[PDB]
């Protein structure tokens, strides 16, 4: 019983994190086989944050100009190349604590546990979810750029952020781990703003699942509702769309609690046209979004 | 900038667990030094639930009745002796993995990361404090007890808690590493309530000054107010009292921001008699007493 937000073990990730310097500026670094990746704005000096020229940057830089350390181990650099926003450093010694591991690139509502970072020491984790406008509301101060995020599948695990920077309104820009920003950023001082945040819909009707399962089900109701109904009062709420794909996911959940996907639909619906009243559900006064089915799933199992 | 409820990297804690099965019943051990610390209802069957005889359990009990594995990797036992509600196993082979550790017994309001494991195998972390009323709001399926909390002070592991059993209310009892229960709580199935909760005051004061950092403060009241005259809105709110050991505490918060504490709490006051009109601090739509002044500090500071 209980429901809590909820990491994956750090363990596997903390045995890959390295320190880059490079002149004066130190980041976090990530060390899997005999390569280290890291943000490639590891190159800037504090003239070149308005607009630097990393390929201009990167030419007049050679192996010796990059300092990497595990702990009080000093690994040499013997190849480096850069791949779209990410540097990546061929090196002398192969990890020899690199886990079963995979690049991937999450879609929008998918969630990872994120290890924080400062000067290749980890801090701490929470879990976050990727943000409709390809944003995340995260806890990160200055030098904390080169921290990851990843899901973990049995003892494999998938990369699938490393970050960057920090917009104005102090939220979280950053890449996959073949340098791709997620969302339309690039790494530099500009004006980039976020665009407008929606709310994870599939992810909130999970939660009131997970929700009813733990005990909390003075929320449902006693109508129900169809796809196009449901999903223009969601437009209305800056709710995203309602998929087939989103009510076939919900599947499982729905099975289970005896509870069809509309019904759940309808009960949301009431939420969002009545609030909550200054009532909680699951210990919350606001609607949930950061907790995919899969989340629950595993929480409301028990799967290691 | 941002702030999130923050677990430590659980990667020491992940190489002390293990599995403990006895008879037909297997739950979670922690193996530290050349002994294996479980819950001492591992000796209990679905007969003696009610009320077992625990000394005349271990009584009728030897070395090899317990089974002990390390993923795919047999220990054999050479000692065991009962402690409290702890049983203590010594072992042929001292964990080759234990880190620096210390057993404490934490105080109420002060908070931890947990690590649920099932089958000696851990499936996540999150963090959450010691309630009032000394039970937890934590995630625990079937067979999670033996899962411990912990802080970690620079590499120096601190365990506070052991997990052991469930109420009637879906919320969560258990034991220091000596084997004494949190609470007035005893290991048997029996009528066993809580008491009524109340809100760690400090802690809430503590979050709203992360909130004043991060560049939320909309709840910034224009008034002050004296320990006496806020403790008596305190008791009203079911909110625990206010120290002078609070206050100081929080000298370091207070120096930072520029607001004195009493202008704090006066502030706070404001919010416990109007309520938050459907407005959000740092994302929260309640009041948020599940963080300390050193989790604000460490998380606003970046101590690795
Ligand atoms: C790497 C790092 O910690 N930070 C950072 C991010 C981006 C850059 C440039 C791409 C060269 C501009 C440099 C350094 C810092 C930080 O100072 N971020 C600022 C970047 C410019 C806009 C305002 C934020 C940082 C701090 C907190 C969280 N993430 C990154
Ligand atoms: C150890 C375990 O996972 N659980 C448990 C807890 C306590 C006992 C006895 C002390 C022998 C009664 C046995 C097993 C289970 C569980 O079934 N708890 C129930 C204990 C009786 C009252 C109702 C709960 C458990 C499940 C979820 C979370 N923690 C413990």
Redesign the pocket.
């Known amino acids: 019983s209980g429901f809590r937000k909820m990491a994956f073990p750090s363990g596997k990730v903390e045995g890959c994190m390295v320190q880059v310097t490079c002149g004066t500026t130190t980041?976090n670094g990530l060390w899997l086989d005999d390569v280290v990746y890291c943000?490639r704005?590891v190159i800037?000096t504090s003239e070149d944050?308005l607009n630097p020229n990393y390929e201009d940057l990167l030419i007049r830089k050679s192996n010796h100009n990059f300092l990497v350390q595990a702990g009080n181990v000093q690994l040499r650099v013997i190849g480096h190349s850069m791949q779209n926003c990410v540097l990546k450093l061929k090196v002398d010694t192969a990890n020899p604590k690199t886990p079963k591991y995979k690049f991937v690139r999450i879609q929008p509502g998918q969630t990872f546990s994120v290890l924080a970072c400062y000067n290749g020491s980890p801090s701490g984790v929470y879990q976050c979810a990727m943000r409709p406008n390809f944003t995340i509301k995260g806890s990160?101060?200055?030098?904390?750029?080169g921290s990851v995020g990843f899901n973990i599948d049995y003892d494999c695990v998938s990369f699938c952020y490393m970050?960057?920077?920090?917009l104005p309104t102090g939220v979280?820009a950053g890449t996959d781990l073949e340098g791709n920003f997620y969302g339309p950023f690039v790494?530099?001082?500009t004006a980039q703003a976020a665009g407008t945040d929606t709310t994870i819909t599939v992810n909130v009707l999970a939660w009131l699942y997970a929700a009813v399962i733990n005990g909390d089900r003075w929320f449902l109701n006693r109508f129900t509702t169809t796809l196009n109904d449901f999903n223009l009062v969601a437009m209305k709420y800056n709710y995203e769309p309602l998929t087939q794909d989103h009510v076939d996911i919900l599947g499982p959940l729905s099975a289970q609690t005896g509870i069809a996907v509309l019904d759940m639909c309808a009960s949301l619906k009431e939420l969002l046209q009545n609030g909550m009243n200054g009532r909680t559900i699951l210990g919350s006064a606001l609607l949930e979004d950061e907790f995919t089915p899969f989340d629950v799933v595993r929480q409301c199992s028990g799967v290691t």
Chains 1, 2 share one sequence.
């Open positions: 980041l943000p704005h800037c944050m990160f101060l200055n030098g904390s750029c970050h960057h920077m920090e979280h790494d530099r001082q």
